[model samples]
Target chain A: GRELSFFLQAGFFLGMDAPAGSSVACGSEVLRAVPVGDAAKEKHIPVVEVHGHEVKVKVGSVAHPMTPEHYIAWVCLKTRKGIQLKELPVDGAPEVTFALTADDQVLEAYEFCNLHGVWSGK
Target chain B: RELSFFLQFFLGMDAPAGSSVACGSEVLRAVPVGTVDAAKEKHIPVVEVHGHEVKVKVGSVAHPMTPEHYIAWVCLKTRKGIQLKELPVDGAPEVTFALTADDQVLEAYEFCNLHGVWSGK
Candidate 1:
């Protein structure tokens, strides 16, 4: 299904320029992706350990701004089956951790920046 | 297939309140489904007329607007799909447009940074 395994198609073109109406520019793309584990601390990625069926996804391994002018708007998680698990609206927080089946093929993460458009993490 | 249609709406509460879902330290609560028009103004939802356009507004009773906590956007979902309207930390969540069909179904959504999403039909 198109919903489950879609690519980061929009906003990655031509730097920061975006087309009018509907087309959002992808400026700040998700820079890191690491599966939750104890070795995650040794890696540059933040510590987000998975417990049983819960998976904690942390966006902006390098902290993103949370100001009014430039901020990460939302973060979304989807399954490989195309079923969306959750979409969290962000304010000052840079990451969100949610529950997901340990067996579910967690496909990728989608995040939106108020000015930079949307980015994804695989 | 579109990500726009996959938008999920929920209300964020201070603690574990309502139908709570954990998001970091806070809780993402689910709002009961209902009509958008009559929810805020206590009247029938607005309709598009020859002289006036239909306007929709979304908000909580006394939601804060500080830089640390505020609504990030308001999304309107109809049969045609979803329309997203971004809002400032200090601005009101609202949308105005003309409707050709009187029987249109509208789902109004408001997203709070700290709390979560609150939606009405």
Candidate 2:
């Protein structure tokens, strides 16, 4: 129930000599994860751990579900160096490993579930 | 299962089968490189290739992540096809995609709700 995008309409993905990958600017508006409380924290809050030069964070103390209807949409690691995010599929693991400098510090960690909402663990 | 992944990435918002998603529509491309300024700094994607994995951070420094303005998604394109992950506001602005030998061409991209789209290789 959607119209073809300009690139798709131009046949970009089908090997047409359509243009792609050029940066552009647009209007602002976006995504927000509803805050999750303690009751759902066990399954929504992320668990962050730091390794040598990498930060590996899991979606929950208990693994979150990866189903079609409900799942973790994204996992993130906020750090002094940079903030990183990983998009997850309903079929993929709800985990993300963020690389950092040897001396980098994790400022925060968070995750968003499709149905439940967002939680913080860092 | 992989098809569902493909559908979401290439088609945008489950835009039906037998359709296509372009590099320009939902995804922004070829951002100016380097930490040139604060304007471009928080809008471009930074990519790092690690043989089997490629890390993509939304901004060279850091991007804002409130509900009003944030990086909406990140995508990794290989010679095989394209894969994307949707990001939420208040989350980190980075992503790491697992790659394969078949994934020879590595390009990463992100869509910022405020800044639009930007890309890196």
Candidate 3:
């Protein structure tokens, strides 16, 4: 049996064991949690701030590791114009901050974990 | 005066500043580095290969790696969309991967934070 555990900032807990014919080791544990606008508000999830041409997105309350073995590989921004990706190194910080036009309405921010899977925030 | 220096493993040099283009929050200066096939000759030589291990470098000289400027990542791809690896750039832009297939047509990609994406076969 495979178990996956997710912890949210608002003290919410979600734990599930793999069902029949499924395994967690194969990147099936994607999107442990999604932070929607309202969900972020309800759960105290921080919203990315827009400043001039820059957008700052902070992930997880704690700092995510930047090691080669496990880290946030990249952060993607889905905007009205197109999708842009930002790659991160192990030594870089745990946030995604980049420049985009104010006209670009960022509908979503997606982050990929090397070991886990993808997580998104709206 | 903004100065940018690029080094290739084969002792090639490119220096430029201004004539900049905007990329996200940063400005990038354009310098004609050459095509991927041209770049591979100097930078992408096989560093090591043992069994399934493969090591590849994407720059002729060591590219700059500051927060403001850096090599973004390296991607390896094939025709069937198999053996895909996207390695994030940290200090330097280099990658190593283990694959079972040894004699498949492989394409290489390298991204620059300021410039854009470059491809090699």
For candidate 1, write residues A28-103 as lDDT tens digits.
3321111122222222233344555444556556666666677654455554322222333445466655433333
Poorest lDDT segment (10 consecutive residues) of candidate 3 chain A: A22-31
Per-residue lDDT value at A105 in model 3:
56
lDDT of 1 at B85: 41
**What is the clash count of model 3?**
5
- Model 2: per-residue Cα lDDT over B1-121, one tens digit each: 1221122223232223333233344532223223233376777788887766677887789788889888777766665445555665767888665543444545666777555556677
Ranked by TM-score, top first: 2, 3, 1
lDDT per residue as tens, model 3, B34-116: 33333443344233454544455666666666678666555444321222223344545666543333233265555565655
- Pairs of residues clashing in candidate 1: A4-A82, A11-A26, B10-B117, B12-B115, B36-B121
lDDT (Cα, 0-100) at A41 in candidate 3: 31
- Estimate the TM-score of every prediction: 0.32, 0.44, 0.33
Which segments of model 1 are wrong by more than 4 Å? A1-51, A85-90, B1-121
Report residue B117 deviation for candidate 3 (angstroms): 14
Please state the error at residue A110 of candidate 1 in Å.
1.1
lDDT of 2: 0.55
Candidate 3 lDDT, A1-122, residue by residue in tens:
21222222211122222122221111222222332223333222324666655667666655566777877665655555334445555677767664443444556665656555556666
Q: Pick the candidate with the highest lDDT.
A: 2
lDDT digits (tens) for residues A1-122 of candidate 2: 11111111111221111233422121121111123345787778888887666667788688888898888776655555344445665687877676554435777776767677556787
Residue B53 of model 2 has an lDDT of: 66
The candidates, ranked best first by lDDT, are 2, 3, 1
lDDT, candidate 2, at B40: 68
The TM-scores of chain A alone, one per candidate, are 0.52, 0.68, 0.57
Measured by DockQ, the strongest candidate is 2
